[PDB]
Design a protein around this ligand. Structure first.
Ligand SMILES: NC(=[NH2+])NCCC[C@H](N)C(=O)O
Ligand SMILES: NC(=[NH2+])NCCC[C@H](N)C(=O)O
Ligand SMILES: [Fe+2]
Ligand SMILES: [Fe+2]
Lengths: 335, 335
């Protein structure tokens, strides 16, 4: 498989769950300053075989994601799937939010965005009625097209963490790496040049945040990136193992640059044809390598009956200080 | 103080020492592939108050270094200071090398350079007879001028770790941060521009490595950086908290750029005047923030009697994959 996989034993999974439940008893909130600081050290108490997997697999050269299977979830304890992210911090989902945060702390520094879901660090992926055909993660009937998370931003996550609270119909997450087996050298050369434009996705729009949040100055920086994007490369790093920065629904060539456009159009077709599926069943956790892979989610028919697919999500950076200019409480944004 | 300081209790220090001694009993070498992979997880067993300090202090906005005082060292067990780094992996220093590696694993991914001390990850700082007036860390009578470690390279460490095995005369390490209180806006503007040159320091020269190592192809890349340096900036990141890349003895303006030269000359004088001292006594460990601070070492008169000042040293990155293009066994270099 193109990702690295780990399966908890039932005893390991129970121990991790018990640690998260203890955290939920001892801290008021996952995003509070106290748990943000303490979670990386508390995670040292997770099952050792899991800590070994996370410490080693992050350093491997090849995986598109790190996948951990087998966390127990009881639908009766979890409760119904919220109708909106605003009300999605339910008591039934609270221990599992702490659990995701603990796993994330083994990989890096967690953070959020002032412009996304009210600046929350642990965010929610669930279908919002009336928002089926949008470009944000609360879509359903329209596929979420492949993209680098927050491609517009130099401060985008290194890893995107996902914990599947429920997914009864097995809706697939989509992934693709760099199609290096099919990129000719000239096309590769062009993709490494600063000849492309990449704008903020719709999740950072004020209409996708609560009222009283539309006044955050960080939305100004989002407007600047959408109205005046600066040219950037799509590929960076080692030509034999490039890092990837692209959004299928927001990337464009520089104005009038037809050679850049040809390279991007070629890349689109290669990624479309190599896109593959990862199904996060209930209790599965994935950390997607946001430099090696683009990701999306298949179209699906929402239920709106209380048992819709529901993920918790978290952004992770290897170095919080890389985003110093955007520090707005572990919440990023710029004027 | 401009750095963040932690002092082990005697019991904490004994526990950390016992963990390192166990590591030395169970692994053949500090730089072996096995201990390189295992050390970050073994470090989870270090005293919890120290793990809390390392997890929190790395995320603070201000410190130039993280300093840990109080590791016991017995000069009789340690043995005499080696006459050269080649023979400096003595049994008496072996547990303390494991200890430095364990501490380092709390901060990031350790690595070495094919061109420096035979590609070792744990390296040695000690005075080499006849090499008193050099630009490398085995100098003595000539001050080691302030510099960003491996300023020439985009793959330079985020943190430089130092463990003082002995320092009987209290010779000071030197540090300085960005002199932001005195840089006018125009000078700051220029330092943020790609108008400077920075060449590899003498530690990467073949004459400062063993024979049979002069044939490594990685020395080719060092020659390229010294013969054909590309223009770079000295400051990057947030204008209110810039990251720093400069070498007092190897930085230069771009050819004929007199405004760049004025900015660099101004920066030199401000750093000279703000340089301060940190004395690593026997058993003290420091992790210098190589993005916030330049560092050096005061001139001193070497002894050459077996009790000279002696440090173990290690390079740390927050993200090993940033250097993928230079991956040569956790040892970096390029053709
Ligand atoms: N091509 C796209 N749809 N890009 C935007 C992706 C959606 C965004 N990451 C979200 O969480 O809502
Ligand atoms: N200005 C300088 N002396 N630069 C080079 C510093 C010495 C180098 N870091 C070493 O370990 O030997
Ligand atoms: Fe995404
Ligand atoms: Fe140094």
């Amino acid at each position: 498989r193109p990702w690295s996989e780990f399966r908890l034993t039932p005893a390991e999974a129970a121990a991790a769950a018990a640690l998260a439940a203890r955290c939920a008893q001892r801290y008021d909130e996952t995003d509070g300053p106290e748990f943000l600081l303490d979670a990386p050290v508390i995670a040292h108490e997770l099952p050792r075989r899991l800590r070994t997997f996370m410490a080693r697999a992050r350093l491997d050269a090849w995986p598109h994601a790190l996948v951990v299977r087998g966390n127990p979830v009881d639908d009766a304890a979890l409760g119904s799937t919220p109708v909106h992210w605003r009300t999605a911090r339910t008591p039934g989902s609270r221990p599992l939010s702490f659990l995701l945060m603990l796993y994330a702390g083994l990989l890096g520094d967690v953070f959020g965005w002032a412009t996304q879901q009210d600046g929350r660090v642990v965010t929610d992926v669930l279908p919002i009625k009336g928002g089926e055909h949008t470009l944000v993660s609360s879509s359903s009937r329209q596929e979420l097209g492949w993209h680098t998370e927050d491609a517009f931003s130099p401060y985008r996550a290194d890893y995107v963490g996902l914990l599947s609270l429920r997914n009864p119909d097995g809706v697939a997450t989509t992934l693709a790496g760099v199609p290096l087996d099919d990129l000719d050298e000239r096309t590769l050369d062009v993709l490494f040049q600063e000849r492309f434009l990449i704008r903020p996705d719709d999740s950072h729009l004020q209409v996708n945040n609560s009222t009283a949040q539309q006044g955050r100055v960080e939305f100004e920086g989002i407007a600047q990136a959408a109205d005046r994007p600066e040219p950037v490369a799509i590929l960076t790093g080692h030509r034999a193992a490039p890092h990837l920065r692209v959004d299928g629904d927001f990337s464009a060539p520089a104005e009038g640059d037809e050679e850049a456009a040809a390279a991007l159009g070629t890349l689109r077709k290669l990624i479309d044809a190599s896109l593959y599926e990862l199904v996060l069943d209930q209790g599965d956790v994935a950390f997607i390598d946001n430099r090696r892979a683009v990701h999306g989610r298949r179209a699906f028919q929402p239920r709106y009956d209380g048992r819709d697919r529901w993920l918790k999500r978290i952004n992770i950076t290897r170095d919080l200080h890389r985003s110093r200019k955007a520090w707005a409480s572990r919440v990023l944004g710029q004027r």
